[PDB]
Write a protein that binds this ligand. Structure first.
Ligand SMILES: O=C(O)[C@@H]1O[C@@H](O[C@H]2[C@H](O)[C@H](O)[C@H](O[C@H]3[C@H](O)[C@H](O)[C@H](O)O[C@H]3C(=O)O)O[C@H]2C(=O)O)[C@@H](O)[C@@H](O)[C@@H]1O
Ligand SMILES: O=C(O)C1=C[C@H](O)[C@H](O)[C@H](O[C@H]2[C@H](O)[C@H](O)[C@H](O[C@H]3[C@H](O)[C@H](O)[C@H](O)O[C@H]3C(=O)O)O[C@H]2C(=O)O)O1
Lengths: 379, 380
């Protein structure tokens, strides 16, 4: 499979069994095709579909509200907003690209993966329509920056924390590699998207917000590099992937994993079991890419000997019994998010207990959740 | 005496008197409230018709919302029929603009009407009236007097009345319209149209199948149904029905929902059981504000089965002191501040000084813009 943001071993396995006519996989993929029909019909979304413009006056600039920031009722105008960690302010739904970037990413990811498995041009054609409109269209495509992501009303300082919103469309950028060679994805489409991704990568690496987010000491820094690797893999910069893993990701794990395997930065959050998991999910998506060029992020040590498997070990009994979690968790933890994580970490580590638990938790066979498409092994 | 309506009339009367006498503490407080209310003077009046997705009637004037705990079923190709996840609000609710717009309207109209009653400034009555006309009576922008499509659920086959509870945000604004009668801005023609709207809404509430079913609900839905009912009846000056509703529906429902230890078993089985225990009593509290203005105290009057609402407060009081000791499901954090007004209301009605003290110790923030706290300077 081409380099991209997915378990390549599982995708290659699905395509091969589908091409041999294997009954269980053929039936599974035929279910997924029924699920994907809505994305063939879906009108492509654009970041420009908003009324309230960002301070640039440019509808092509992505803008969202940082989700944990609320108006202050003791201020006459509610300004400046104040932080309530773990409490999502419903005002976030006033910025259409918060949910539309998710809907776009799901649509393009599903369609590109189904084109890779089946070879049906109808999937590449629809994938291409979503990609062109979200990324490259000179009127409807988004500017390659995250300047106004997770803005906060009244906040004086610039922040890079909104960059983490990019993971919702950077997975779609990576899956675009899967539709290269189709009739629908022309050399002109590829050149424009190569150019967009080059500009997005430039902004990521050199803007102040990008720089600050690259140095964040919690899951923001881990997710930044997961996104970075998606952009770099799209652009075939395998040398850069090696450098990022060795000079950013591994040092970050070494600093963020404690000696007992806990993630102290996540333990002080109000949703601490969720944010411990979210950190490892960032490592999990990074590893899907690094392991396609021979770097296993679950078992490769930092310079201090700490390994990401130690973080899984610490959390494993709490994936078995979330009720035993002893740190602040002000909403219930969804055990199901452990399923793909424990499968990913278990296979990478040869840890059969992890894989068994991933299957016992499982995923629903007929779920339409697009990220579960490769994981028939869990359904 | 203040007009009959959905507010603590004793505190409102005391604010108006002190304000007219020039008392410093009250004058300063009301001047803050006036600064707060300025955004409502400028605010463009909202309308239920400001939606794109129309309801099955094809009438933009029909109120329609999504029942908040119902979600697409990902294991179905079209996600239909939706399934219930108690206590987990599905963000799709924000696709129906009147969910939050009925809230914003209710806040604007309540604040402006209360401030006209306290200050006598015509500017507050004029703005209040603009919001009322647009939301209720306007022949194009005003809502139809029903809740047929409130809290609909995609794929659900049966009709439900559970969405009626959405009415409490605008029925409080209806009640406060009584406060602007006599202003120059609220004409006799305006009052007549709103009287006719409220009469039609009252008919729908009482005689539609959805209204009848909600009137029979065995949990906080039944209590909120009658709290809303009293607001409509008080707006219409039907003091006879207020007495009958209190004696024949509210007290028997309240008595039937209270267990031997004072707990509310219908609310204890919810995923937000401390919230829904509190929410049940808030319905009784708002109901009592109206009944006690004609001499019926719902906190201390026993039902015919011997149960009295004070017993429910007694059960919950230690958990307002320490919400973490709550031993039932509460999958999101409980806001202790919601205990403040509840304990003041129940404490004052019962002569329980322990409750009132706790109410002030928890307190409300002096400068808050929350319109429901306007009468409660005693807590600020
Ligand atoms: O005030 C409230 O409790 C409201 O809660 C939500 O309504 C709930 C509530 O449990 C209702 O009593 C009703 O429950 C029904 C329903 O059939 C439910 O599916 C289950 O079978 O129990 C029934 C019962 O208790 O008799 O509807 C529930 C629902 O989520 O639809 C909402 O109305 C909410 O807005 C309000 O806060
Ligand atoms: O942790 C996440 O991945 C995350 C996702 C949400 O979308 C949102 O970005 C949220 O971010 C919060 C997290 O604490 C960030 O690390 C940052 O925290 C900074 C913030 O200014 C905070 O008040 C304090 O100063 O810590 C800062 C830091 O850099 O640690 O933003 C948080 C926020 O809620 O904005 O979590």
């Amino acid at each position: 499979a081409p380099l991209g943001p997915f378990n390549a071993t599982l995708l290659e396995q699905l395509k091969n069994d589908y091409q041999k006519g294997e009954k269980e996989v053929t039936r599974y993929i035929e279910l997924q095709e029924k699920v994907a029909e809505k994305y063939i019909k879906m009108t492509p979304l654009s970041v420009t579909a908003k009324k309230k413009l960002p301070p640039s006056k440019d509808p092509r600039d992505y803008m969202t509200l940082s989700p944990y920031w609320w108006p202050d009722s003791t201020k006459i105008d509610g300004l400046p907003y104040i932080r309530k960690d773990g409490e999502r302010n419903p005002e976030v739904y006033e910025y259409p690209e918060r949910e539309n970037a998710n809907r776009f990413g799901d649509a393009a990811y599903c369609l590109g993966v189904l084109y890779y498995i089946t070879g049906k041009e109808v999937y590449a054609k629809a994938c291409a329509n979503h990609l062109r409109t979200w990324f490259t269209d000179p009127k409807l495509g988004m500017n390659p920056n995250m300047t106004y992501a997770q803005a906060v009303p009244g906040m004086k300082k610039m922040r890079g924390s909104g960059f983490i919103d990019s993971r919702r469309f950077s997975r779609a950028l990576g899956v675009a590699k899967l539709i290269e060679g189709s009739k629908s994805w022309t050399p002109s489409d590829k050149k424009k998207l190569d150019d967009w991704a080059t500009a997005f990568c430039y902004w990521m690496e050199n803007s102040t917000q990008g720089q600050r987010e690259s140095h964040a000491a919690n899951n923001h820094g881990l997710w930044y590099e997961a996104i970075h690797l998606m952009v770099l893999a799209y652009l075939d910069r395998t040398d850069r992937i090696r450098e990022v893993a060795e000079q950013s990701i591994l040092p970050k794990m070494g600093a963020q994993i404690a000696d007992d395997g806990s993630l102290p930065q996540e333990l002080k959050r109000t949703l601490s079991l969720h944010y411990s998991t979210f950190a490892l999910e960032a490592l999990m998506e990074a590893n899907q890419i690094t392991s396609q060029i021979g770097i296993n992020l679950w078992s490769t040590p930092a310079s201090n000997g700490k390994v990401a498997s130690q973080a899984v070990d610490y959390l494993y009994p709490f994936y078995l019994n979330p009720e035993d979690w002893k740190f602040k968790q002000i909403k219930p933890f969804d055990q199901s998010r452990a399923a793909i994580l424990l499968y990913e970490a278990g296979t990478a580590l040869g840890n059969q207990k992890y894989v068994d638990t991933a299957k016992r938790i499982g995923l629903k066979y007929s779920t339409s959740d697009v990220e579960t498409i490769p994981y028939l092994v869990l359904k």
